[PDB]
Amino acid sequence: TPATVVAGVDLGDAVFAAAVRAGVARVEQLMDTELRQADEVMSDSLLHLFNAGGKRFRPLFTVLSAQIGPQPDAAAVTVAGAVIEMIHLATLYHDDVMDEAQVRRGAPSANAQWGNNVAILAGDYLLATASRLVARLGPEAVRIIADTFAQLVTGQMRETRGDSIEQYLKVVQEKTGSLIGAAGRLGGMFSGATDEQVERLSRLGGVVGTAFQIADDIIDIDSESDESGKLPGTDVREGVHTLPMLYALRESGPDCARLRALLNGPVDDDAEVREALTLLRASPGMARAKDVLAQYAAQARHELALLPDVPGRRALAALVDYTVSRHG
């Protein structure tokens, strides 16, 4: 693992990487401290996912966004990182209940080990914790995080009420773009970046988050649990039709009637899920989804290009390549 690599992204320079690595570690320490302040009745459920792993993509994105401003190591950037990751963690607790996930980060899901009730409450406690933490940053950050969480939940809700491509693109911008947008906005604000750099990092975050979710939906089909830390074909199993599945479902082919039959609702038979994965992996619809993913990567590169010629810009460019190429 190269010394220039932090949370899977080659940042290109070992001293810059060490600084970003330290920034991501400070976020981890503030979260670890806040989770361990909880009542003993909360502690085990709260540590369950936190200690299992996770890429810390959102702390990395926050810290890289803060590298654009003149105070990237500001205490307030660490608080912003911790707020974003706390919200992210809260959403995994609820999302794994909603998707009936048995595995998360290569271990039993919070709901598999503790049950849905403990998982729902662990997620609610993390949202209270995020709320107390963001209060430290002032009223503008409080409003950004409340609005951000409203958007994220709107996306989750839009997905559940939900085969439309435009609806899917609104879902992923809401449920995944909004929070990475907020990470960029807050990393910019609390590093002392300019108003213009703050808006550019927010737009970048939103596009990166959209790309991130499309890659997640591809990972659902193309990755094995060894790389993803979760069960492939969860979207097939739950009847969530993501972009590769929507494009596969618009194909004509000797197996397309069979795939239409398999994906016509939730799939509770694991062998049928595996059969649907075989058909999806071979579908030209997968290449169509990957081409859309590349279009979002191109939009993100268009956004970040007008940041300054500073290590943070190169590091964001490498993060965009990681967002779309990662296997987990």
Ligand X SMILES: C=C(C)CCOP(=O)(O)OP(=O)(O)O
Establish if 174 lies at the interface with Mg ion (CB under 5 A).
Answer: no
Region binding Mg ion by CB under 5 A among candidate stretches 29-37, 72-80, 120-128, 211-219: 211-219
Please choose which of Mg ion, a copy of itself, ligand X, none residue 168 contacts, taking the beta carbon within 5 to 8 angstroms, the exact cut-off set by kind: none
Interface with ligand X (CB under 6 A), residue from 91, 111, 148, 178: 91
Interface with ligand X (CB under 6 A), residue from 19, 59, 72, 99: 99
The 243-262 site mask, x for binding a copy of itself (CB under 8 A), equals --------------------
* Cα 88 to Cα 57: distance, rounded to the nearest angstrom: 10
Structure tokens at 224: 């094995």
Region binding Mg ion by CB under 5 A among candidate stretches 62-70, 88-96, 117-125, 308-316: 88-96
Establish if 41 lies at the interface with a copy of itself (CB under 8 A).
Answer: yes
Residue 303 Cβ, how far from ligand X at the closest point, in Å?
A: 19
The 43-82 site mask, x for binding a copy of itself (CB under 8 A), equals --x-------------------------------------
- Distance linking the first and last C-alpha atoms of the chain: 16
- Annotation-wise, does 55 bind a ligand? yes
The 220-259 site mask, x for binding Mg ion (CB under 5 A), equals x---------------------------------------
Closer residue to ligand X in complex, CB, 13/102: 102
- Annotation-wise, does 290 bind a ligand? no
Kindly tell me the sign of the dihedral angle through the C-alpha atoms of 26, 121, 220, 317.
negative
Nearest Cα residue to 276 out of 240, 245, 231? 245
Residue 254 Cβ, how far from ligand X at the closest point, in Å?
A: 29
Asked whether the beta carbons of 207 and 323 are under 8 A apart, the reply is no
Establish if 314 lies at the interface with ligand X (CB under 6 A).
Answer: no
3-state DSSP of the chain:
CCCCEECCEECCCHHHHHHHHHHHHHHHHHHHHHHHCCCHHHHHHHHHHHCCCCCCHHHHHHHHHHCCCCCCCCHHHHHHHHHHHHHHHHHHHHHHHHCCCCEECCEECHHHHHCHHHHHHHHHHHHHHHHHHHHCCCHHHHHHHHHHHHHHHHHHHHHHHCCCHHHHHHHHHHHHHHHHHHHHHHHHHHHCCCHHHHHHHHHHHHHHHHHHHHHHHHHHHHCCHHHHCCCCCHHHHHCCCCHHHHHHHCCCCCCHHHHHHHCCCCCCCHHHHHHHHHHHHHCHHHHHHHHHHHHHHHHHHHHHCCCCCCHHHHHHHHHHHHHHHCCC
* Residues in region 29-88 near ligand X by CB under 6 A: 54-55, 57
Establish if 169 lies at the interface with a copy of itself (CB under 8 A).
Answer: no
Please choose which of a copy of itself, ligand X, Mg ion, none residue 92 contacts, taking the beta carbon within 5 to 8 angstroms, the exact cut-off set by kind: ligand X
Interface with a copy of itself (CB under 8 A), residue from 22, 157, 287, 310: 157
Region binding a copy of itself by CB under 8 A among candidate stretches 121-129, 187-195, 288-296, 302-310: 121-129
Interface with ligand X (CB under 6 A), residue from 92, 193, 208, 221: 92
Cα atoms in the Cβ-side hemisphere of radius 13 Å centred on 290: 13
- Annotation-wise, does 13 bind a ligand? no
Which residue ranges are tagged as binding site for isopentenyl diphosphate?
A: 55, 58, 88, 105
Which residue ranges are tagged as binding site for Mg(2+)?
A: 95, 99
- Residue numbers at the binding site for ligand X (CB under 6 A): 54-55, 57, 91-92, 95, 99, 101, 105, 152, 175-176, 213, 216, 220
